[PDB]
């Protein structure tokens, strides 16, 4: 699974996600990746999210929309919405993985509850940050 | 706010124990180049939507990441790929699931978004739509790598 | 304890309307009886949707609309608000009751969703019957296809 | 497209949705019906929802889950939530249709913005209500 989220200079949000799925997967099975609100969501009013992890769980939890709704309706900050979904709701459904999110205000979050998540982020005209492991 | 990109190439059991620095650096170098390309497009005034498309197209091309080239194998030693893209402005979206003959499923997903009255297309149906829009047909053999084949054998019995 | 059903939303003699009313009543009545008898919400929405699939008046199973190519492609999904488990199939043409296939995916597989032949193979390998897609074809829906093309 | 939503005597909600799609549809098209939180969602904490109509719009607006999030996080009554989604947010994206929804208190809502929704409901050991057209 791979993904990207962007805020542009016009203030527009977008999200994209792509995968080959799980090694040895049953032909015809579909995880969260291609499912709007599970593996991928963006709305200029909230957040752009791209998700990676247990598809069954990311679908049942609507991981990516849940970030949006928690912010839009709940009044959670991105940091708060990300902790809630990735560190609490997804583990209690048996979900492992993480996500990348950018909110309309340009806050960036890269939460994951796994050992690692291949990831990078940068502000325009700034130097990038990369990561594999925690911290 | 400030224009910004985030990318990922997957989450899970990545063990510090299991890698050399040279191995780690191949992933850091890949990630850095892709995020740097997106930072350059953003800075030039390209849309979030075009930026998240090219980033995911580069992560697809990158054989280290499980999407497009380097996709994992199915139990039948096939590849079946899915992708999604969403425009936060228009709230338009597009997706493909179960495609095996499209090199860049995030491009097929952009095509569903921008050139159809639909959000999601699957299988040969999705492929036939894309070919009809002039998207090029490939063999699913293009996605195969030894790394991912090795992981397949390691996971099973002969 | 309560049930709601629908047979779809969209753009008639009374006798004709009454056929829809009758069908809807028998199905809501069956679901009410099951509820009263203590059956699970899960079993009740499954059977209600199975009966709506079997009814040729509604666009699901028997009476499914026609594609641009005069074929039938069916989707279904079921969700249990108790365990929050779910199951779905999309693009299936040889399963009489896609809602029963969705249940099977929910119960007997680790995935929420399966599609196309792979959804069908999963089902057949678990004893679900293969049908000809012809069996969904009705006269009313064919003529609605020809109308649509015009 | 057909659906059912149910609350049982144990206070469990469930939802189910099935369809042939839309007449003349492009082969390989997939609407809201098979997508959790789009055509179908059940959670004992909120609501069970089955949706029918413009598949593309019910996906983009995550209609089924949006009812649940509006109630849970937003504090909307089932009635207010259903009115917002079906009367305001679905048409704002160029979609028509409706949905059936039962909350954990056993309120029933059957909103649609179309000329017609074939629909019926009843509390256990009560005579059912049926309907095709508006009101
Ligand atoms: Na790749
Ligand atoms: Na039917």
TrEMBL record, chains A, D:
Residues reported to bind substrate: 29-32, 52-55
Annotated keywords: Autocatalytic cleavage, Hydrolase, Protease
Active site: 1 (nucleophile)
GO MF: hydrolase activity, acting on carbon-nitrogen (but not peptide) bonds, in linear amides; peptidase activity
One biological process term in Gene Ontology: proteolysis
Protein name: Isoaspartyl peptidase
Organism of provenance: Escherichia coli
Gene that encodes it: iaaA
């Amino acid at each position: 699974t791979v993904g990207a989220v962007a805020l542009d200079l016009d203030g527009n949000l977008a999200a994209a996600t792509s995968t080959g799925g799980m090694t040895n997967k049953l032909p015809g099975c579909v995880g969260s990746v291609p499912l709007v609100g599970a593996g991928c969501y963006a709305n200029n009013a909230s957040v752009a999210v791209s998700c990676t992890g247990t598809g069954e769980v990311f679908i049942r939890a609507l991981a990516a929309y849940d970030i949006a709704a928690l912010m839009d309706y709940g009044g959670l900050s991105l940091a708060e919405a990300c902790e809630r979904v990735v560190m609490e709701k997804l583990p209690a459904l048996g979900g492992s993985g993480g996500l990348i999110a950018i909110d309309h205000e340009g806050n960036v979050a890269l939460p994951f509850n796994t050992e690692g998540m291949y990831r990078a982020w940068g502000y325009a005209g700034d130097t990038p940050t990369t990561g594999i492991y925690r911290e | 706010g400030k224009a910004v990109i985030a990318i990922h190439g997957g989450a899970g059991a990545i063990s510090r124990a299991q890698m050399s620095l040279q191995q780690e650096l191949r992933y850091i170098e890949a990630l850095s180049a892709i995020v740097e390309t997106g930072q350059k497009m953003l800075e030039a005034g390209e849309s979030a939507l075009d930026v998240v498309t090219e980033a995911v197209r580069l992560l697809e091309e990158c054989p280290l990441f499980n999407a497009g080239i380097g996709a994992v194998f199915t139990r039948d030693e096939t590849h079946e790929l899915d992708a999604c893209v969403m425009d936060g402005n228009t709230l338009k979206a597009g997706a493909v699931a179960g495609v095996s003959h499209l090199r860049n499923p995030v491009l097929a997903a952009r095509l569903v978004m921008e050139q159809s009255p639909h959000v999601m297309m699957i299988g040969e149906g999705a492929e036939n739509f894309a070919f009809a829009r002039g998207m090029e047909r490939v063999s699913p053999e293009i996605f195969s790598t030894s790394l991912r084949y090795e992981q397949l054998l390691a996971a099973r019995k002969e």
